[PDB]
Nucleic acid binder design. Structure first.
Ligand SMILES: Nc1ncnc2c1ncn2[C@H]1C[C@H](O)[C@@H](COP(=O)(O)OP(=O)(O)OP(=O)(O)O)O1
Ligand SMILES: [Ca+2]
Ligand SMILES: [Mn+2]
Length: 430
DNA sequence: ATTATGACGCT
DNA sequence: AGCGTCAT
């Protein structure tokens, strides 16, 4: 009852860029705007691999992970932009720099947590309190929420989408009690007003469109963001959760899309997030562990406590390359050349990071894959990173892996290497 | 031959 | 620490 926490203490948003790498390329090349188009890396094998897809191209069935040659079968007029290649490898600098553009704008409104190259969480609780005082019990006009969906509305007593959006928004606003400055529903609504402003700023100042979710925690904000993309934002209220979750496949919730989620389904014999409410906390802890069990117990009621962490910058800087099939590295000269290529990109990025962000990395992680292993990584070893020098880092990396070589001959490398990875970690202020 | 990342959990 | 899981 009255002591039952409802997880309505915070206002959290998740802002996620629409088809991000495609928009970056469309800004640069106007010929790609408002077209079926995709971003591809490499070229020789099956036309390259698609990693981002415009919404026009999605209508033809083009998806991420698809080979471009196959995408062209679905969409003959598909336009393609290629990821830059430097030092023999794909280089994602353009997209990292475009990410910084957006993150810095978001940071003007609130402290953000960078969750990926194209999305960040926002804790808007304090900003909402501030705006609520400015409003002075003034109702929120629908005009302040021009791209907002209210999940679950309209209900009860019609065929256009924009019309449906406004119907839902009007039902929501009509029910709002703006007299209570601690009403969670009102707080979410003001949160949505701020996120409209945030999204307008991003589009004005970068040219990039995005979607957003507004709710009381990160998992619901993330889920919300996806409901109406692209170029729209969605408010998921605490009250909307029972209906929303009653038909929501468990795999849709962030962190449940893999083995744990499959285990929840298998062990409990359920399909939807809402079905979790019928288990005790102890029951869930018994199957999935203390931490997961408590997290699931709360999550299926719309409650989550994970904080928005004040972190705008990545914690690591890494540079990775696969060497598939026949291209696997089978000579020491090969291995050394590619370690140097990776190290040179790493040095470049590290030097820029040090200048921009007043920090220095102190640990170098080296990872490889050997031909045969189905795991992402076969071996991961750390050594000290004491100088931002590519030849030193590549020599050090070679030192830490050189005994993985099964070959009795040391000119040759066996089993051939199908992946190399260098990562700088453990930053200190400088 | 679904690549290049990047965070956090376990023991 | 080195590995695994999940994610974008
Ligand atoms: N598996 C991947 N491999 C390489 N790059 C990826 C992968 N997934 C995502 N990216 C990159 C390209 C994306 O444009 C960018 C953001 O990813 P994501 O938010 O999942 O999709 P998206 O922004 O392209 O479309 P959406 O509008 O559906 O969000 O990160
Ligand atoms: Ca996105
Ligand atoms: Mn994203």
């Amino acid at each position: 009852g009255p002591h039952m926490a409802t997880g309505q203490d915070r206002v959290v948003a998740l802002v996620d860029m629409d088809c991000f790498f495609v928009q970056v390329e469309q800004r640069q090349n106007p010929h790609l705007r408002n077209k079926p188009c995709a971003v591809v890396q490499y070229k020789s094998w099956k036309g390259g691999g698609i990693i981002a897809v415009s919404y026009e191209a999605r209508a033809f069935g083009v998806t991420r992970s698809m080979w471009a040659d196959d995408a062209k079968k679905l969409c003959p007029d598909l336009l393609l932009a290629q990821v830059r290649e430097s030092r023999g490898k794909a280089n994602l600098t353009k997209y990292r720099e475009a990410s910084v553009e957006v993150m810095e704008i978001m940071s003007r409104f609130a402290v953000i947590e960078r969750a990926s190259i194209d999305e960040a969480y926002v804790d808007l609780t304090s900003a909402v309190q501030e705006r609520l005082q400015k409003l002075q019990g003034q109702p929120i006009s629908a005009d302040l929420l021009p791209s907002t969906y209210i999940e679950g509305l309209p209900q009860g007593p019609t065929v256009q989408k924009e019309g449906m959006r406004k119907q839902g928004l009007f039902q929501w606003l009509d029910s709002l009690q703006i007299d209570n400055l601690t009403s969670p529903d009102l707080q979410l609504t003001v949160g949505a007003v701020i996120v409209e402003e945030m999204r307008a700023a991003i589009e004005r100042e970068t040219g990039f469109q995005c979607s957003a979710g507004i709710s009381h925690n990160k998992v619901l904000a993330k889920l919300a963001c996806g409901l109406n993309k692209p170029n729209r934002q969605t408010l998921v209220s605490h009250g909307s959760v029972p209906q929303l979750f009653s038909q929501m496949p468990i795999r849709k919730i962030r962190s449940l899309g893999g083995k744990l989620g499959a285990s929840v389904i298998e062990i409990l014999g359920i399909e939807y997030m809402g079905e979790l409410t019928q288990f005790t906390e102890s029951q869930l802890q018994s199957h999935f562990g203390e931490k997961n069990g408590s997290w699931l117990y709360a999550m299926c009621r719309g409650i989550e406590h994970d904080p928005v962490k004040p972190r705008q910058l990545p914690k690591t800087i890494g540079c990775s390359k696969n060497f598939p099939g026949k291209t696997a590295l089978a000579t020491r000269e090969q291995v050394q050349w590619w370690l140097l290529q990776l190290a040179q990109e790493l040095e470049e990025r590290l030097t820029k990071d040090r200048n921009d962000n007043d920090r220095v990395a102190t640990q170098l992680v080296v990872s490889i894959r050997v031909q045969g292993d189905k795991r992402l990584s076969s071996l991961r070893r750390c050594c000290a990173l004491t100088r931002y020098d590519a030849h030193k880092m590549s020599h050090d990396a070679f030192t830490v892996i050189k005994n993985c070589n099964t070959s009795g001959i040391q000119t040759e490398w066996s089993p051939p290497l199908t992946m190399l990875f260098l990562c700088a970690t453990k930053f200190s202020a400088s």
